[PDB]
Design a protein around this ligand. Structure first.
Ligand SMILES: CCCC[C@H](NC(=O)C1CN(C)C1)c1ncc(-c2cc3ccccc3nc2OC)[nH]1
Ligand SMILES: [Ca+2]
Ligand SMILES: [Ca+2]
Ligand SMILES: [Zn+2]
Length: 367
């Protein structure tokens, strides 16, 4: 039936700034929040402010040296950490900005707090749009991500769940999450992503895990221009098979919005309805679910996407006419919730989609 939804948000998150021209804009989290408040979605869910995750909570995965560096580095002492910045990959993509550590603590706090709430059986769904920073590694920042809130939230879920399923619909391969759990069967990672001359360069369908984790990493490589029809016809069959074979007791769904049509960095052609169909599909399985954010660089579309996905989590139909809000002008010229796909060519032929699906089904028979 309808599910209890707990949502995490810190009003300060929107003030963190990566720097002039940097595509990652924490302000998109505040736009999302303001839009769903204006649709009246706060009446249907419990809103929590995350705690600031401690260096200690973060070292459940990250190395002590990397976390110590994140806690110490500031724009005023950068010149003294030249060697450490290189070692930890903090620079152009992952800049040093005022309040960087606090931004990581809030992003992480929401995901970990959501996992605790699910473990305690106090909610059916937990949402943290500031989370989903899937590229961060054990001792390295990567692709605008510094602390892997997903890995930390999964480790929390593993205290009470024998098997956890991770699903990643961000346009980028969920490399940091797959790497953390590559050699274990206690977490199955499933990533759908653009593959070929594209960041981070991993996620070939031949990457299936290693040791006890062999067959527990699933990668669906895609080309430019995937649309709602093509994505929908592959997502429900893959997730259904994964649910059937793996039988997880909890799910983490990374909802990176950079897979939408018109994304500044992305080359896909999904609409908000096509992206949200993934949430609807995962919801039908009736398992404890942690919904996270991720990429998304055309901020008006990110706000539309995550507002609609929160409405989906609540089984609440919301009008297409956008209500007035603090960022109303960002949604011009149409002022509608839903988006139209572009006329870009879909390089993912129906035969290619069926062929990759068939190759992945062969691997799933090995469970
Ligand atoms: C989702 C993560 C995407 C990361 C990607 N980075 C890379 O491809 C670099 C090359 N590798 C050594 C990593 C990337 N794509 C675009 C950028 C980018 C970074 C910027 C940093 C400071 C300022 C502007 C930037 N503009 C960018 O793209 C327009 N960075
Ligand atoms: Ca992905
Ligand atoms: Ca695994
Ligand atoms: Zn991404």
């Amino acid at each position: 039936g309808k599910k209890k939804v707990c949502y995490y948000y810190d009003g300060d998150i929107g003030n963190y700034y990566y720097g002039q021209g940097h595509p990652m804009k924490p302000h998109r989290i505040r736009m999302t929040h303001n839009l769903l408040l204006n649709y009246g979605l706060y009446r249907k869910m419990e809103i929590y402010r995350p705690h600031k995750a401690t260096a200690e909570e973060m070292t459940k995965y990250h190395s002590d040296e990397y976390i110590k560096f994140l806690r110490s580095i500031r724009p005023d002492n950068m010149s003294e950490y030249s060697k450490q910045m290189q070692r930890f990959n903090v620079g152009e993509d992952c800049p040093v900005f005022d309040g960087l550590f606090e931004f990581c603590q809030l992003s992480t706090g929401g995901s970990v707090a959501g996992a605790v709430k699910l473990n305690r059986q106090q909610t059916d769904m937990a949402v943290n749009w500031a989370g989903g920073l899937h590229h961060a590694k054990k001792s390295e920042a990567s692709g605008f991500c510094y602390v892997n809130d997903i890995v930390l939230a999964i480790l929390e879920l593993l205290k009470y769940h024998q098997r956890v399923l991770y699903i990643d619909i961000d346009i980028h391969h969920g490399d940091g999450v797959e790497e953390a759990f590559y050699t274990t069967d206690r977490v199955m990672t499933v990533s759908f992503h653009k593959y070929g001359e594209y960041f981070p360069g991993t996620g070939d369908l031949r990457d299936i895990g290693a040791g006890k984790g062999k067959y527990y990493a699933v990668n669906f490589p895609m080309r430019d221009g995937i649309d709602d029809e093509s994505y929908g016809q592959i997502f429900k069959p893959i997730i259904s098979k994964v649910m059937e074979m793996y039988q997880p007791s909890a799910v983490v769904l990374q909802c990176g919005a950079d897979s939408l049509s018109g994304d500044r960095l992305g080359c896909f052609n999904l609409t908000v309805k096509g992206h949200a169909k993934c949430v609807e599909v995962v919801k039908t399985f009736n398992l404890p679910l942690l919904m996270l954010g991720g990429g998304g660089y055309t901020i008006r579309n990110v706000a539309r996407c995550w507002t609609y996905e929160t409405a989906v989590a609540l089984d609440c139909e919301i009008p297409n006419e956008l209500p007035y809000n603090d960022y109303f002008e960002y949604f011009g010229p149409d002022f509608k919730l839903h988006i139209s796909p572009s006329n870009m060519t879909n390089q993912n032929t129906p035969e290619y989609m069926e062929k990759i699906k068939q190759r992945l089904f062969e691997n799933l028979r090995m469970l």
